[PDB]
Design a protein around this ligand. Structure first.
Ligand SMILES: CC(=O)N[C@@H]1[C@@H](O)[C@H](O[C@@H]2O[C@H](CO)[C@@H](O[C@@H]3O[C@H](CO)[C@@H](O)[C@H](O)[C@H]3NC(C)=O)[C@H](O)[C@H]2NC(C)=O)[C@@H](CO)O[C@H]1O
Ligand SMILES: CC(=O)N[C@@H]1[C@@H](O)[C@H](O[C@@H]2O[C@H](CO)[C@@H](O[C@@H]3O[C@H](CO)[C@@H](O)[C@H](O)[C@H]3NC(C)=O)[C@H](O)[C@H]2NC(C)=O)[C@@H](CO)O[C@H]1O
Length: 517
């Protein structure tokens, strides 16, 4: 490999690459207390392992606004001795409110009834055995979400008037998504059958459709999915909603509209196959030029050219298109062309093909499918979790395969930035997953979320079994959003690559194999 001292890193631009190499120093204990002093301002994304690792060296004291400093010297026993500003600041915390004695909640409720009746409602609510039931009786919507955030355990029936107020609050999106996907708060869930589709849109409308289906309310479901179809920004999400309109009410205009979609996704591909519509046009990228001056193995060069491409006018893109129109830079070319045709055309490149042409055509397609979604084939790709290269191996996994299993001499996790190694480790890991899971959809779930996650999901008696709307409904209820989306996208990619390799499979065969018989 190649190493970077903290001093060389401090001279590179802030980026995930620089963060990755700082994290490597921290995990090998190579950052002194002295080196760590100014280090916060050299970190692009100060979240997760790099933060908990830096704070083992230089602990951070949780920020308190100097205006309110004196407000945090009071406790539940002395809050009545604080000025009215301090009293109102401390009451932002429901935990603080829960900690007060009931007589001091009655006193502060009276004090704030006039200018802050939100605080009065929460104080008087915690003087009852069911704060949620009190807040719901007041139809205090801000209080409702502050309570939900304090504890997910509150559950109560909500009437038509109250549930139709919830969508107007910022918190409604996450609330509806989490309780429907996690199958928690059954009374909240049942209550959301009465939300007017007029009052919701986009993701929330869609999840309220999935909710209606779980109660076999097919009419309410169609209406939610239709509103989702009308309001969603991305054609891919519209297609998903229109598919549900079709599956529930079987109007052949919905399926026609879906078969004619400019988005390539499992729903449009399926609709095309049901209507004997031809397979969509795939762009053909074949640059004659061999190489250029750019190092595809320099993670720092990628992070920098990535930013330039994001922030380029039409004029600079046409200059970048020409520079990067080579076989060695094909994945960057495809990325520039995607931005330059304003995301209208279908690019499914097959770079470093020599490394996979000896595997059977089905395996080539799964590898390419995963690589396209993982990295867009960028060899030095780095995730916010520092998953590495074209196939986005987490370090623990790259090291387990490289060191324990393959005993590669002088193995370093940065070998995942080499196409040869990424494709090779991809094949090796896919043999592990495919031997246990079979379906390329299940393999996709396990590649992104893990075989543990996937085994526990498939073992549930309500996931990927026989039913009216299966396996489509199961694909909407995969409990980890990243994995739910990853499966749909990789499956679409798999169908396309199998077509380009003259090893076509019908997506309807894939869907039949998802139901465990
Ligand atoms: C080269 C480039 O910037 N291309 C654009 C794409 O980035 C963009 O879609 C997103 O691609 C990235 C990979 O570049 C995807 O990130 C990966 O997500 C998977 C899980 O799905 C995760 O396991 C990987 O670690 C992660 N990789 C990295 C490097 O973080 C991301 O999920 C894609 N976005 C979506 C919505 O799926 C496409 C489409 O907008 O545009 C290209 O121009
Ligand atoms: C491509 C990539 O890096 N993907 C990551 C996932 O692999 C990872 O999920 C976890 O993967 C490991 C490695 O396969 C799983 O560990 C295995 O667990 C089984 C039983 O559950 C055990 O018998 C195996 O011996 C063990 N192998 C090793 C080498 O430890 C682990 O279970 C997966 N985790 C879950 C929650 O399923 C995920 C999340 O860590 O990240 C991906 O990026």
């Amino acid at each position: 490999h190649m190493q970077y001292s903290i001093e060389k890193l401090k001279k590179e631009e802030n980026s995930l690459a620089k963060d990755y190499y700082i994290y490597r120093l921290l995990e090998k204990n190579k950052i002194s207390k002295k080196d760590a002093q100014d280090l916060n301002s050299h970190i692009f994304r100060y979240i997760g392992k790099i933060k908990s690792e830096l704070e083992k060296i230089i602990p951070l004291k949780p920020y308190i606004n100097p205006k309110y400093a004196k407000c945090y010297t009071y406790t539940a026993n002395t809050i009545l001795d604080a000025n009215l500003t301090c009293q109102s600041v401390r009451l932002n915390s429901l935990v603080f409110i829960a900690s007060l004695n009931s007589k001091d909640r009655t006193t502060l409720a009276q004090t704030f009834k006039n200018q802050r009746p939100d605080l009065t409602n929460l104080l008087l609510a915690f003087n009852t055995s069911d704060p949620m039931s009190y807040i719901v009786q007041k139809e205090d919507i801000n209080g409702f979400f502050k309570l939900y955030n304090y504890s997910k355990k509150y559950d109560l029936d909500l009437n038509t008037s109250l549930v139709n107020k919830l969508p107007n609050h910022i918190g409604f999106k996450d609330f509806a998504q989490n309780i429907i996907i996690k199958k928690e708060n059954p009374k909240f869930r049942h209550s959301m059958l009465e939300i007017n589709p007029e009052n919701v849109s986009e993701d929330s409308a869609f999840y309220l459709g999935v909710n209606a289906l779980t109660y076999d309310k097919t009419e309410l479901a169609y209406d939610f999915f239709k509103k989702a179809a009308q309001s969603f920004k991305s054609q891919s999400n519209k297609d998903n909603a229109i598919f549900w309109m079709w599956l529930i009410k079987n109007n052949e205009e919905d399926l026609k509209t879906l078969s004619q979609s400019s988005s390539l996704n499992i729903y449009s591909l399926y609709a095309k196959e049901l209507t004997n519509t031809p397979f969509p046009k795939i762009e053909s990228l074949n640059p004659s030029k061999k190489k250029n001056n750019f190092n595809m193995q320099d993670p720092f060069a990628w992070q920098k050219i990535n930013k330039q491409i994001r922030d380029a006018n039409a004029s600079q893109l046409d200059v970048l298109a020409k520079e990067f129109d080579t076989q060695e830079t094909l994945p960057i070319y495809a990325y520039i062309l995607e931005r330059k045709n304003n995301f209208k055309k279908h690019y499914f490149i097959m770079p470093y093909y020599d490394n996979i042409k000896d595997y059977n055509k089905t395996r080539q397609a799964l590898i390419l499918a995963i690589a396209r979604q993982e990295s867009r084939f960028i060899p030095t790709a780095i995730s916010v979790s520092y998953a590495l290269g074209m196939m986005q191996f987490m370090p623990f996994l790259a090291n387990h395969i490289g060191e324990k299993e393959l005993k590669i001499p002088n193995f370093d996790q940065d070998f995942m930035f080499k196409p040869e190694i990424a494709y090779y480790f991809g094949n090796y890991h896919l043999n592990y997953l495919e031997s246990r899971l079979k379906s390329p959809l299940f393999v996709a779930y396990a590649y992104n979320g893990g075989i543990g996650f996937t085994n526990r999901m498939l073992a549930r008696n309500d996931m990927f079994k026989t039913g009216k709307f299966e396996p489509f409904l199961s694909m909407e209820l995969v409990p980890y959003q990243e994995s739910r989306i990853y499966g749909k996208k990789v499956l679409a990619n798999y169908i396309v690559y199998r077509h380009l390799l003259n090893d076509s499979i019908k997506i309807s065969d894939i869907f039949e194999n998802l139901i465990q018989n």
